[PDB]
Design a protein around this ligand. Structure first.
Ligand SMILES: [Mg+2]
Ligand SMILES: [Mg+2]
Ligand SMILES: [Mg+2]
Ligand SMILES: [Mg+2]
Ligand SMILES: [Mg+2]
Ligand SMILES: [Mg+2]
Ligand SMILES: [Mg+2]
Ligand SMILES: [Mg+2]
Ligand SMILES: [Mg+2]
Ligand SMILES: [Mg+2]
Ligand SMILES: [Mg+2]
Ligand SMILES: [Mg+2]
Ligand SMILES: [Mg+2]
Ligand SMILES: [Mg+2]
Ligand SMILES: [Mg+2]
Lengths: 207, 259, 157, 98
RNA sequence: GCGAAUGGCUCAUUAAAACAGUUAUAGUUUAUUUGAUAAUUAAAGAUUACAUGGAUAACCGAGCUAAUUGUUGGGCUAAUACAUGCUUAAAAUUCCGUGUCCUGCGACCGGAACGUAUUUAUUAGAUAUUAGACCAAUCGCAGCAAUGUGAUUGAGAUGAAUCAAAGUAACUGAUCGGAUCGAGGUUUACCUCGAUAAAUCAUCUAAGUUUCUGCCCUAUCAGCUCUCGAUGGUAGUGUAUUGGACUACCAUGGCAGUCACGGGUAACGGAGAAUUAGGGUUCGAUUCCGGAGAAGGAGCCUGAGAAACGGCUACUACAACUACGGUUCGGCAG
């Protein structure tokens, strides 16, 4: 009965505070649920594991214990595909969560560019594989291929950081979902303000 | 507390039921329905102590359980010892084709008004909330916990509708604005009926309202307690105890024993 | 680089625009969360053109204000964006038919927008519990001068 | 034969699984043997006899898999007229063809 | 399948704690009720929907123990139990094909996605408090173009929303979308009124937590809280949700003679009770309400709902039976 009643505290004026009530059941406090990753099945066969907990109203709440694949969205483009997350880096909350590759709502991680690479290719005619072969278009320029241009000319100035990411195969993104609460793990792809920044934490972190 | 209450005490059951103090110890507890606990009249009360058609407790048990159906609430059959008949309702006693209004006194006691097959058709509804829901559709809701689909758009949240029960049709509504007639569903002033004077909103969380009536008395109550009994002076239903207006203990005496 | 990192590990907004804004390369991109609690309260000029990321603000967050609204003098400036206001009222004494003085202390949250100072009158609103004590946010600040002891100062404000 | 079940000199039955030649005491939840319900979670500290057979065993039930040349009276002499014939539409036809 | 978490007894604990009078829930859960709402069953699979599949009580029969609403073990058949599952709308929108025409990512053509909910990212929701003007560009209304026109229709709700309703992208698929049940009619094609299961929104009911104000003696109680939380900030956990409620990192605060902190109380708080010129004095275990508890204490199953306690687990102290192996539906503050 790990409770959370604010009684076992000390009122403003730090004087101990009285109790007449045994711990009451609605102050429930469930066992924490650290969330790891299977981006290393060196031991861990069963890729992802999610256990459902019977919550109050009568509903179920799925709890993420072990995972390997989540869903992520590229802010800029409005694209979202399910991908395989790689390694967790910098958890902010604490560095131990990174050491155990645990999944906090706001844990910054890596993903496979594959789905985004695949897409950025189909909609713009730009693979993002090593720079030289850059574009891959059609043979004749009379029909609908005229659009991959129109979009491509949209000065798709995807930050020098977004570019490097793709080619390296790794992609930076933060999460936005309580695994211990919904069982999933969804995140947005890192960019501008935070990208530049979180990276800094990483550059200086190792150096 | 253990869980959720489930009974009710003679002593604790509302003064609106004009109940028997010596009576027993309990009292039929209203069933979760269209009207709130305090603002309601469970059938058992309605027939036994009210109409007096029933009497002993088992008397009811017959009436509402008998395969004949003797009680109707707003054009529907009811067989629950304590269905919470609320304000502005219409109850019909099958076996006699009796039609009643569930309305409060001027002294705040639940009164039964006898209606003609005519009014028994329309029932007055007050508007709870108003917002648009699923697939671009408009919904209105009445105190009577009525949920309305595609309602006339010229209806603001604090409105009052006239309902044709027979066709489950609306007709002639009327919001609350300076210059209308109203009934107060609850308060130190319930059972009164007058002309709305003005509505001063204070937003800080509680707007108020003023009123006048027959002897031109000044009334004060919170909006939530105003029910628009009609638009521009003409009331829409026959009121109990003559007109919705109470007398000084002094006026009662002079009217009755003429002092 | 300052308002963003400054120790803490990130500071976005409720309306996660940012980096995506680079999509609307012509109009105004520098959006920040804008709001208006209303209730007869002006929204601070400073609140709008600020770089501050205070989730506990009543103009920069989905923090509501409801019911109880307060006016009280300020006691301390310490604490991170939190202040203690002291209210001074009289209490009646049934028997002797007179009053005594009394003071309740209140934990108030202060969005960066308005600038504090010790010993000034402040206006708090009723916002959801933000912490053990906090349950009030500042909405309107009036600067005032008290030459010295804030404790000595007792005004039926 | 198949060792069908166990009973101790004290009426204590066996529990497939609890592999221990003796009696252990456990908390039983629904879905267990030697445990009856009555209000979900009737969890009980009931004591039961192991899975491993021992000299402490008083009665062992057996299930005849393959009988031999030999003949036992009580066994081969029987011809039980099971009373309940199919009752679900589908089970009915399954017996008569159709 | 519901109920057993109502009631009933008691006051030991309990002095801003509980309580009361007030307020909040834009920080939440609510089985039963009342009103309303659903054209699309997801992919792979599989496929009957005039409708699927497998097993088990009761029963038959064998048995154990000294013992209890103990229970082994073999054979038999039904469900609203369990398990699995069939169901063509169009338009629109979005995207794709090196498809035509044309250049507007425009038009026609063809292909794909498309309920609801879940989980995120993003677009727009035009604070109808808030008037207008000129040139350019885009935009939309006529539109082959020319030239225009027009800036209009618009805007559910609140004091206020990162509200309601909605567009795009994808995720889970353990959300839902009835393989059930009556009765009364009637020359057919069936017809009429009901039961019940169950999703979401309301609604009722109740519950958490919450704002403010108010308590008896006492300093032979003056400094208290802070090694782990004491006060605030950050991020996460966790919960029904808020919150240091718990974790990590950071700041050092928070309370006090307008009596903190600590101690006593034959102190559960009110509604009220006894005497009363007025003002007071003394009580409130005790029919209403709220709280707490069931031998002391902690833990939990189950459920919409209790740390329940006329349910369970272990410990401390006990109560009942014994063939001393073991057992108890063992807790009268009903
Ligand atoms: Mg439910
Ligand atoms: Mg009932
Ligand atoms: Mg309000
Ligand atoms: Mg002075
Ligand atoms: Mg039963
Ligand atoms: Mg208090
Ligand atoms: Mg069998
Ligand atoms: Mg098409
Ligand atoms: Mg028939
Ligand atoms: Mg938080
Ligand atoms: Mg004390
Ligand atoms: Mg007392
Ligand atoms: Mg009581
Ligand atoms: Mg309460
Ligand atoms: Mg007794």
């Amino acid at each position: 009965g790990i409770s959370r009643d604010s009684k076992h505290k000390r009122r403003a004026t730090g004087g101990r505070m009285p109790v007449h009530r045994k711990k009451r059941a609605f102050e429930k406090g469930r066992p924490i649920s650290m969330t790891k990753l299977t981006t290393q099945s060196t031991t861990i066969t069963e890729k992802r594991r999610i256990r459902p907990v019977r919550v109050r109203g009568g509903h179920l709440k799925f709890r993420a214990l072990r995972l390997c694949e989540g869903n992520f969205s590229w802010g800029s483009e409005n694209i979202t595909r399910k991908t395989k997350i790689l390694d967790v880096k910098y958890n902010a909350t604490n560095n131990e969560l990174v050491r155990t590759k645990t999944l906090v709502k706001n844990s910054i991680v890596e993903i496979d560019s594959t789905p985004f690479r695949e897409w950025y290719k189909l909609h713009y005619g730009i693979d993002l594989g090593l720079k030289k072969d850059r574009t891959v278009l059609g043979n004749k320029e009379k029909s609908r291929h005229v659009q991959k241009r129109v979009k491509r000319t949209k000065a798709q100035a995807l930050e020098k950081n977004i570019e490097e990411q793709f080619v390296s195969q790794r992609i930076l993104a933060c999460i936005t979902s309580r695994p211990g609460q919904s069982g999933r793990a969804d995140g947005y792809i890192l960019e501008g303000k935070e990208l530049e920044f979180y990276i800094r934490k990483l550059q200086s972190k190792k150096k | 507390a253990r869980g959720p209450k489930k009974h009710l005490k003679r002593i604790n059951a509302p003064k609106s039921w004009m109940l028997n103090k010596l009576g027993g110890i309990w009292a039929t507890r209203p069933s979760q329905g269209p009207h709130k606990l305090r603002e309601s009249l469970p059938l058992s009360v309605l027939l036994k102590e009210r109409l007096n058609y029933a009497l002993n407790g088992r008397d009811v048990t017959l009436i509402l359980n008998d395969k004949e159906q003797n009680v109707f609430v707003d054009g529907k059959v009811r067989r629950d010892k304590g269905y919470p008949t609320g304000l502005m309702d219409v109850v019909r006693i099958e076996k006699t084709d009796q039609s009643f209004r569930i309305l409060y006194d001027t002294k705040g006691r639940f009164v039964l008004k006898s209606l003609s097959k005519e009014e028994a058709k329309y029932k007055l509804l007050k508007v709870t909330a108003k917002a648009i829901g699923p697939n671009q559709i408009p919904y209105i809701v009445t105190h009577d916990s009525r949920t309305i689909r595609f309602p006339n758009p010229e209806i603001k949240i604090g409105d009052t509708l006239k309902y044709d029960l027979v066709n489950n049709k609306i007709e002639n509504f009327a919001h609350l604005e300076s210059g209308n007639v109203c009934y107060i569903q609850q308060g130190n002033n319930i059972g009164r009926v007058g002309i709305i004077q003005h509505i001063e909103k204070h937003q800080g969380s509680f707007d108020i309202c003023h009123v006048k009536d027959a002897k031109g008395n000044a009334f004060a109550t919170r909006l939530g307690n105003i029910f628009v009994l009609g638009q521009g002076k003409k009331s829409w239903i026959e009121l109990p105890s003559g007109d919705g207006v109470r007398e000084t203990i002094l006026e009662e005496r002079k009217r009755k024993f003429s002092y | 680089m300052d308002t963003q990192i400054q120790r803490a590990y990130q500071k976005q907004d409720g309306v996660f625009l940012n980096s995506k804004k680079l999509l609307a390369k012509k109009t105004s991109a520098g959006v920040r969360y804008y709001k208006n609690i209303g209730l007869g309260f002006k929204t601070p000029k400073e609140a709008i053109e600020g770089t501050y990321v205070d989730k506990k603000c009543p103009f920069t967050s989905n923090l509501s204000i409801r019911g109880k609204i307060i006016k009280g003098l300020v006691i301390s400036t310490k604490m991170n964006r939190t202040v203690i206001i002291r209210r001074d009222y009289l209490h009646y004494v049934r028997k002797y038919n007179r009053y005594e003085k009394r003071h309740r202390n209140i934990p108030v949250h202060i969005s960066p927008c308005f600038s504090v100072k010790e010993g000034d009158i402040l206006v708090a609103g009723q916002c959801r519990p933000i912490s053990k004590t906090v349950r009030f946010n500042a909405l309107q600040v009036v600067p005032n001068e008290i030459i010295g002891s804030v404790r000595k100062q007792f005004l039926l404000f | 034969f198949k060792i069908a079940g166990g009973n101790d000199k004290d009426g204590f039955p066996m529990k497939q699984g609890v592999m221990v030649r003796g009696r252990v005491r456990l908390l039983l939840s629904e879905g267990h043997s030697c445990f009856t319900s009555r209000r979900s979670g009737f969890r009980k500290r009931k004591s039961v006899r192991g899975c491993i057979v021992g000299p402490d065993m008083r009665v062992l039930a057996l299930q005849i898999v393959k009988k031999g040349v030999a003949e036992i009276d009580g066994l081969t002499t029987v011809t039980l007229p099971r009373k309940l014939g199919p009752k679900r539409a589908n089970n009915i036809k399954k017996l008569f063809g159709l």
